[PDB]
Structure formats: structure tokens, C-alpha cells
Amino acid sequence: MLGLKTSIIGRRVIYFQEITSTNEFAKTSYLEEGTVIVADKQTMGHGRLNRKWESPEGGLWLSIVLSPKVPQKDLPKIVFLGAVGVVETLKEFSIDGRIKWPNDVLVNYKKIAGVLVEGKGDKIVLGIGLNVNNKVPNGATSMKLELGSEVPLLSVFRSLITNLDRLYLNFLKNPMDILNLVRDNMILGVRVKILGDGSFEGIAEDIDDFGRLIIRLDSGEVKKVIYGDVSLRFL
Amino acid sequence: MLGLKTSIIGRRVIYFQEITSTNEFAKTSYLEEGTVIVADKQTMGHGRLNRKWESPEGGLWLSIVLSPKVPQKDLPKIVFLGAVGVVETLKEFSIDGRIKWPNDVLVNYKKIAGVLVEGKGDKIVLGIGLNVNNKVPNGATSMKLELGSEVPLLSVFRSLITNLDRLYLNFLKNPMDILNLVRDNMILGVRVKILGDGSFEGIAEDIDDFGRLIIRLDSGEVKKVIYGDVSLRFL
Numbered sequence: 001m002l003g004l005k006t007s008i009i010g011r012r013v014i015y016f017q018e019i020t021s022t023n024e025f026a027k028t029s030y031l032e033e034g035t036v037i038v039a040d041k042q043t044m045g046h047g048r049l050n051r052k053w054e055s056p057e058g059g060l061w062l063s064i065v066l067s068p069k070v071p072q073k074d075l076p077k078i079v080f081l082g083a084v085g086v087v088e089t090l091k092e093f094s095i096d097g098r099i100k101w102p103n104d105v106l107v108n109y110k111k112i113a114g115v116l117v118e119g120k121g122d123k124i125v126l127g128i129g130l131n132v133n134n135k136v137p138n139g140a141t142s143m144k145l146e147l148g149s150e151v152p153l154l155s156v157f158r159s160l161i162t163n164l165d166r167l168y169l170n171f172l173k174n175p176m177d178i179l180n181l182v183r184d185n186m187i188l189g190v191r192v193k194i195l196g197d198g199s200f201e202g203i204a205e206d207i208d209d210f211g212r213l214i215i216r217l218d219s220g221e222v223k224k225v226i227y228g229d230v231s232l233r234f235l
Numbered sequence: 236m237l238g239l240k241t242s243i244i245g246r247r248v249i250y251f252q253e254i255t256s257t258n259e260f261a262k263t264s265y266l267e268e269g270t271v272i273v274a275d276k277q278t279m280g281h282g283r284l285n286r287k288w289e290s291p292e293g294g295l296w297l298s299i300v301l302s303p304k305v306p307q308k309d310l311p312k313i314v315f316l317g318a319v320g321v322v323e324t325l326k327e328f329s330i331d332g333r334i335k336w337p338n339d340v341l342v343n344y345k346k347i348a349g350v351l352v353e354g355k356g357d358k359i360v361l362g363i364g365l366n367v368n369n370k371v372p373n374g375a376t377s378m379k380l381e382l383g384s385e386v387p388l389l390s391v392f393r394s395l396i397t398n399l400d401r402l403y404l405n406f407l408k409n410p411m412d413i414l415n416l417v418r419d420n421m422i423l424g425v426r427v428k429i430l431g432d433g434s435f436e437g438i439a440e441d442i443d444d445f446g447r448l449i450i451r452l453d454s455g456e457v458k459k460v461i462y463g464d465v466s467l468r469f470l
């Protein structure tokens with residue numbers, strides 16, 4: 001009844017009225033690649049750095065099960081697929097979202113979506129949380145708040161899954177393709193504070209072929225930031 | 236993201252772009268009571284007498300896993316649950332459907348839906364096929380054909396599942412209540428040809444509290460038909 005016409009992602013969709021975390025269900029479960037897990041609300045939603053992710057009724061909280069057959073050196077680019085997909089969908093609904101390295105999607109610097117990619121063996125779980133009609137913490141925003149009107153959840157879901165399937169199909173063919181889309185939708189050219197192994201500032205210049213963020217230190221020297229236990233803040 | 240608020244039926248929904256039959260997946264699968272299986276299309280959909288059920292894109296093809304804890308003598312009333320739920324849903328979409336004993340729903344004598352209940356012990360599978368926006372065989376009808384425009388499948392789904400959940404809870408509380416709803420929406424008072432173990436005609440007078448159809452033969456005697464390998468045709 002959902003009417004999806006995708007090739008890999010969304011061939012099957014499992015919906016729960018309530019769940020602890022769609023990412024956790026994807027990890028403890030054995031499901032076919034492309035299967036989408038979605039819930040009206042999550043009681044224990046979480047983000048990167050393992051922080052709480054508010055998941056009230058009205059938002060889009062989903063997880064996608066994947067087993068990407070691509071070189072291990074390319075797998076890290078998977079986190080960008082989710083962010084680009086959200087940006088393309090936002091565009092379809094007249095919203096201009098930008099990517100905050102490495103997984104956040106902001107609108108006028110307000111967080112409207114987050115991406116959480118987790119790995120368990122050869123399985124990869126791509127989790128996406130997008131604010132649509134739900135209330136959000138102060139500082140954040142939603143599609144409803146941006147458009148000043150509710151937006152049918154199914155339509156957004158349909159749009160996002162369709163974009164992700166296309167992006168994924170291309171990813172399997174050539175993992176490098178996603179890079180040009182990320183670069184052209186990412187927030188760069190501004191000064192940022194990085195909290196990884198230590199602490200330093202600089203301009204978010206660009207990301208490289210591996211997906212690492214290129215920071216141009218004031219000393220004209222550079223520092224590459226890898227995805228993981230890292231925090232980025234705009235100064 | 237479907238936003239169902241049901242207590243039992245629809246706490247979980249599994250969707251497939253394509254499937255052989257939702258009724259077959261609902262059986263051969265371990266699933267919690269209330270779980271709903273739905274697909275855009277079925278390649279091997281079938282009905283009551285094992286005839287093919289055309290399931291193209293545009294209609295609602297679903298199956299519900301159930302394990303009602305009620306006396307075995309009231310289980311046969313389960314098939315009426317689906318038929319009444321469809322009638323109540325059609326009412327909500329300004330359509331006047333009536334029940335053709337024991338599982339069909341007609342609009343001006345044209346079949347708009349069929350109900351197929353299958354058992355496997357304690358586990359019961361309630362299957363429903365409702366023509367919405369799909370092309371239908373000659374003689375049949377659909378919500379689109381009745382209304383003059385397409386009807387959002389999700390809205391019909393939400394409506395049907397919500398009605399089925401309410402009816403099911405009342406059913407577990409008192410299996411007899413569904414009968415008055417059936418009588419009030421079933422086609423009665425007309426002559427029908429019955430094809431069960433033999434062949435006879437008569438007026439479809441009413442149904443008894445077991446769910447058996449009361450046929451009053453021309454002689455003056457009445458004959459009772461139980462759900463099973465029986466066919467009914469309006470004369």
C-alpha cells in the first residue's frame with residue numbers, strides 16, 4: 001500500500017507504533033538488505049556520540065539494513081548517503097538544507113535531521129531521524145516550522161527512500177560518486193571548533209576522497225579529521 | 236510514520252512491494268498477534284474457494300495475524316469481522332456496502348472486497364482484499380469507481396485497521412456482538428442458490444448465533460449452511 005518502486009532499499013518496510021530504537025532493532029535482527037525499519041516514536045532514540053535523540057510522534061525515524069559490497073576503504077562514505085538523501089528530499093519540499101560534517105543536516109544553521117551509521121560485522125545500519133511535524137528541542141527546526149504547515153509523513157518517507165535507493169545503487173557502482181554531492185551541499189569556508197582526540201580550530205575547507213574533513217589551521221597547515229568520537233561546532 | 240493508534244491490530248505492519256500472497260506469509264511466519272502484512276501487489280492472491288484474487292497495484296491487500304482466546308464455537312464468526320470492518324470503512328468514505336454471506340462485500344451487487352480467513356491451529360489469518368484505485372474484473376467495483384476519483388490508500392488502510400481493531404477487541408470481550416452488526420449489513424430476504432454438499436434454492440432469511448445462514452426453502456422448511464466449501468449466488 002505504500003507504493004514504493006525502489007530496487008534495493010524499501011523492497012520491504014517494517015513499521016512499529018512504538019519502539020526503543022529502530023537502529024537497535026536493525027542490529028539485533030536478521031533482515032534482508034534494503035529492509036527499512038520505521039516507527040511513529042522512539043523511547044530510546046540516540047545519535048552519534050551516543051546522545052539522546054528526541055523521537056516524538058510527527059517525525060520520521062527510520063533505519064535501513066545494508067551489506068554494501070564495496071572496498072572497505074570506501075565503507076566510511078556510507079554516512080554521507082543518508083545526509084545527501086535528506087538534502088535532496090528537503091529540496092523537493094522547497095527547503096534548503098546544508099550538511100554539517102559529517103552527518104548533520106541544518107537549515108539556517110538549525111538542525112533538522114541527524115544520521116547515525118553503525119556497523120556490526122558485515123552488516124551496516126543506516127539510521128536517519130528527520131523532523132517533520134514533531135516538536136523539536138530549542139535550537140532545532142522541522143519541515144513544519146520551515147514551511148509553517150504540517151507535511152504528510154508518508155510523502156516525505158516516500159521521497160527520502162526513493163532518493164536513498166538511487167544514491168545507494170550509484171554508491172555500489174562507484175563509492176566515489178557520493179563525494180561531489182556532499183561537497184556541494186556541505187557547510188564549508190567557515191571557522192569551526194573540533195573536538196576529536198584533542199581540540200583545535202580552523203576553516204572547514206573540504207573533505208578528501210576518504211571522506212575525512214580537511215581543516216585549514218591558521219598556520220596555513222592542515223589537519224584531517226576522521227569520523228568517530230568527534231564533535232564539530234561553528235564559531 | 237503510519238500513525239496508527241490501535242491497541243492490538245496494527246501495532247506492527249510489514250509491507251512488501253510485491254508478494255505471492257499476504258495470507259501465505261502471515262502463516263508460515265512467526266508473528267505477534269495484531270501484526271499486519273500488506274503488499275502493493277500479489278502474484279498469487281486467492282479467495283475463499285481457492286479461486287484467484289486479482290491483486291494489481293492500487294488496491295488494499297492485507298492479512299492480519301490473530302490468536303483469539305475465545306471458545307472454539309465462536310471462531311467461525313471471525314470471517315464476519317473482516318466484512319463488517321470493510322462495511323464500516325466504506326461508510327466513512329460515503330459508500331454503502333452490504334455483506335454477501337459469508338465474506339463478500341458488495342456495492343449495488345458488485346464485489347468491492349473479499350475476506351479470507353485461514354487457520355493453522357491457534358493461529359488465525361484474517362485476509363482482506365479491498366478494491367480501491369486498482370482496475371477490477373468485469374462485474375466488480377472499486378472505491379475509485381464508486382466515488383469518481385482516486386482515494387489515498389493510506390487513508391483507507393488507517394480507517395480499515397482502526398475499525399478492525401475496535402471490532403476485534405469487542406470480539407474478544409463478547410464474540411456474539413459482531414452478529415447484530417452482520418445482520419444489519421447483510422443482504423437478506425432474497426432468493427439464493429446454494430452450492431455446498433448439494434444444490435438447493437431459497438430465501439436468505441437470516442443467520443443464527445453460530446454464524447450459519449438460515450435458508451427457508453420453498454416448501455416451508457429451513458436449511459442451515461455453515462462456512463466452508465460453499466458457494467452462494469443471487470437468483
Ligand SMILES: O=C(O)CCCC[C@@H]1SC[C@@H]2NC(=O)N[C@@H]21
Binds near residue numbers: 053060062104113115
Ligand atoms: O544526529 C545524530 O547524531 C544522529 C541521529 C540519528 C537519529 C536516528 S532516528 C532513527 C534511528 N534510531 C536511532 O535511535 N537513531 C537513528
Ligand SMILES: O=C(O)CCCC[C@@H]1SC[C@@H]2NC(=O)N[C@@H]21
Binds near residue numbers: 258284295297351364
Ligand atoms: O473474496 C474472497 O473469496 C476472498 C478474497 C480475499 C483476498 C485477500 S487479498 C489479501 C489476502 N491474500 C490473499 O491471497 N487473499 C487475501
